[PDB]
Every structure is written in C-alpha cells, then in structure tokens.
Amino acid sequence: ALSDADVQKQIKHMMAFIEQEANEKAEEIDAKAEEEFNIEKGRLVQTQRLKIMEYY
Amino acid sequence: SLAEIVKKDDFVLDSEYLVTLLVVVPKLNHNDWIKQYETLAEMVVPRSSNVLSEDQDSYLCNVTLFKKAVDDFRHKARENKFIVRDFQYNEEEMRADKEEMNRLSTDKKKQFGPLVRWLKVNFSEAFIAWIHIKALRVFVESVLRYGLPVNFQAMLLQPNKKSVKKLREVLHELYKHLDSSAAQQEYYPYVYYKIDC
Amino acid sequence: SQSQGIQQLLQAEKRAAEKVADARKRKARRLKQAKEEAQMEVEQYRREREQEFQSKQ
Numbered sequence: 001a002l003s004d005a006d007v008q009k010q011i012k013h014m015m016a017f018i019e020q021e022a023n024e025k026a027e028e029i030d031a032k033a034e035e036e037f038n039i040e041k042g043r044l045v046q047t048q049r050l051k052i053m054e055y056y
Numbered sequence: 057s058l059a060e061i062v063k064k065d066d067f068v069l070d071s072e073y074l075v076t077l078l079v080v081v082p083k084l085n086h087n088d089w090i091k092q093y094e095t096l097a098e099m100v101v102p103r104s105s106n107v108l109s110e111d112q113d114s115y116l117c118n119v120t121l122f123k124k125a126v127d128d129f130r131h132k133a134r135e136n137k138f139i140v141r142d143f144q145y146n147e148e149e150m151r152a153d154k155e156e157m158n159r160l161s162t163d164k165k166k167q168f169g170p171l172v173r174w175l176k177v178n179f180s181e182a183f184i185a186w187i188h189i190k191a192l193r194v195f196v197e198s199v200l201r202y203g204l205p206v207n208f209q210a211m212l213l214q215p216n217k218k219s220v221k222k223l224r225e226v227l228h229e230l231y232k233h234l235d236s237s238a239a240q241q242e243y244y245p246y247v248y249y250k251i252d253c
Numbered sequence: 254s255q256s257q258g259i260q261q262l263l264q265a266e267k268r269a270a271e272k273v274a275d276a277r278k279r280k281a282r283r284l285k286q287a288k289e290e291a292q293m294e295v296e297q298y299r300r301e302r303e304q305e306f307q308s309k310q
Binding site: 068070071072073074101102103104105106120 | 254255258259262263265266269270
C-alpha cells in the first residue's frame with residue numbers, strides 16, 4: 001500500500017530515530033564525563049591535600 | 057517446529073534497533089499481509105517482508121521492525137487476524153533438536169538389531185520351557201492317578217476342524233471305564249491339557 | 254528491498270556505535286586530565302605548606 005517514496009520515508013524515519021538516539025547518548029556521555037572529571041579531581045585533590053596537611 | 061524452516065538469512069541479526077519476527081498469515085490473506093504488514097505499527101521497515109515457508113493454510117513471513125514497535129506490531133497483526141510465532145533465530149536449539157532426533161532414530165535401529173535377537177531367543181526358551189512344564193504336568197497327573205511303575209502312553213494330537221466332539225466321544229468311550237466319575241470344563245477320563253497357539 | 258532497509262539501519266547503528274565510543278574516549282581523556290589537575294593542586298598545596306614549615310623551622 002506504500003510507494004517507493006513512502007518506503008524511503010519510513011527508512012529515513014528509522015534512520016532519524018537511530019541518529020537521535022546516537023546524539024542523545026553521546027551528549028549524555030559527555031555530560032557524565034564532565035561530572036566524573038570534577039568528581040575524580042575532588043577525590044584526588046582532597047585525598048592528597050589531606051595527606052600533605054598530615055605530613056605538615 | 058521451525059527448526060527445519062528458519063535459516064539465519066530469515067532474520068535481521070546484529071541490529072541495534074531491529075528485530076525480525078515471523079508471523080503466520082492465512083494464505084487467503086497472504087497478499088493482505090504483504091500489503092498490510094508495512095502499515096501495522098509505527099516505525100517498521102517497509103518492503104522488508106518476505107516469505108520463509110508456506111503450507112496448505114498459511115504462509116510464514118518474516119518482518120524486520122524496530123524493537124519497541126514489536127508490541128504494536130504483534131498487537132495489530134493479531135487485530136488483522138495474523139498470528140505471530142514465538143520464535144527467534146537460535147542455531148544451538150535447532151541443531152540440538154536435529155541431532156537428538158538423528159541419534160534417537162539411530163538408537164532405535166541399534167536396539168532393534170539386538171532387540172529381535174534378544175526377544176527371539178527369550179521366546180525360543182520360553183516356549184521350550186512352556187512345553188516342558190506341560191510335560192511335567194502330564195507326568196505328575198499320570199503318576200498321581202494311575203500309580204507306579206510310571207509307564208503311561210502319552211500322545212499329542214493336532215485336532216481337525218469341527219471334530220472336537222467326535223474326539224471327545226471316542227476318548228470317553230475308550231477310557232471312561234477307568235474313572236467312571238473322577239473325570240465338561242477339564243475333567244476327562246485321561247490326562248488332558250490344551251496347547252494354545 | 255529488504256537488504257536496502259537493513260543496509261540503512263546497520264549503517265545508522267555503525268554511526269551510533271562510533272558516536273558513543275568517541276564519547277567514552279572523551280570521558281577517559283577528561284578523567285585523566287582531571288587527575289592531572291588535581292595532582293597539580295596537591296603539589297601547589299604541598300609547596301605552600303613546605304614553605305611555611307621551612308620558614309618556621
């Protein structure tokens with residue numbers, strides 16, 4: 001019941017879905033990378049700052 | 057079972073979004089399935105439908121679709137009176153089924169071989185013992201009724217059709233004088249057993 | 254046209270895989286940088302306290 005144009009529309013629709021999920025995933029991962037960057041920086045810097053203060 | 061029907065080339069494999077489902081469409085509605093499947097659910101792959109197998113009532117067709125539309129796909133397919141099979145490609149289960157059947161059939165043949173020899177020997181011995189038992193029943197009754205020394209005249213007959221009455225009348229007149237009343241259902245004036253073959 | 258459909262979808266899957274792998278690579282790099290910067294601050298703190306100690310000593 002669907003023509004070549006419509007089947008192509010459906011294929012594009014599915015690809016659009018795939019691309020949207022790909023973009024959301026990449027953005028979410030980058031945001032998490034930023035969060036973990038700051039988290040690890042805090043953990044590390046406080047851990048060793050504490051050690052420094054103790055040696056002091 | 058689809059073990060002998062479904063091939064790896066029937067399913068869309070290694071897809072992130074797509075799954076291939078097999079749905080049985082009655083042959084009368086085969087074209088309707090082919091025409092309708094493309095529009096049964098949102099986000100399905102058009103023109104992907106093909107036929108894996110057919111029988112006298114229906115065709116089994118595979119469709120590739122977005123995973124999350126499968127619920128709508130199978131729901132609406134059912135609404136249009138198409139039946140979806142609960143099947144996904146699985147090489148190990150089909151191979152296991154094929155070998156298990158091949159093994160059990162061979163095992164049947166292998167036991168058959170020894171089966172007939174086993175049972176035929178057991179029969180031979182069972183029949184030999186059977187008649188041996190009857191012979192002993194003859195010995196015991198003959199001695200028990202006539203005393204010793206144990207010299208009796210035992211004989212086998214192969215009765216002729218419709219002569220049972222005559223044989224009984226003859227045997228009775230021939231031997232009735234020995235018992236007169238000790239021996240219908242089993243009692244005759246002589247040792248008597250039947251062999252049922 | 255069943256193969257063209259899946260061709261398009263698997264290429265989209267490929268792109269998605271590349272996108273998320275790259276995002277994970279970025280995460281790994283950012284986390285290493287984060288550790289390096291934290292350690293740099295730790296060294297700054299160390300130098301400051303070491304300087305006060307030696308001054309007082």
